Amino acid sequence: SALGKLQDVVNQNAQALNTLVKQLSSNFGAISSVLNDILSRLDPPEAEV
Amino acid sequence: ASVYAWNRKRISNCVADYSVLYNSASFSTFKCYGVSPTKLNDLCFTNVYA
């Protein structure tokens, strides 16, 4: 634990990046979190929404 | 079937050509939701119910 001060910095940034990546799996109200799935199913008039 | 007792047909393990239906002149209504009628042949489903 002696170098906890340096490890904490590493952990905070690694955690922030992991959180940022995980957010790509969220739908945010969309039919799918996967952009390619939306594009393969819908035409622009609906896909854009 | 009567609408109160509608008939469900399960479709699986097959090739689904939806252009035969969509490009038909014999239907008065053909409305798709959650999917574009012109992209159906590019998609794969885990099940279709008619």
From Swiss-Prot, chain A:
Name the domain of life.
Viruses
Coiled-coil-forming residues are 7-49
The free-text function statement in the UniProt record for this protein reads:
Subunit of the fusion protein that is processed upon entry into the host cell. Mediates fusion of the virion and cellular membranes by functioning as a class I viral fusion protein. Contains a viral fusion peptide that is unmasked after S2 cleavage. This cleavage can occur at the cell membrane by host TMPRSS2 or during endocytosis by host CSTL. In either case, this triggers an extensive and irreversible conformational change that leads to fusion of the viral envelope with the cellular cytoplasmic membrane, releasing viral genomic RNA into the host cell cytoplasm.
Know the name of this protein? Answer: Spike protein S2'
Of the intact sequence, the residues represented are 943 to 991 of 1273
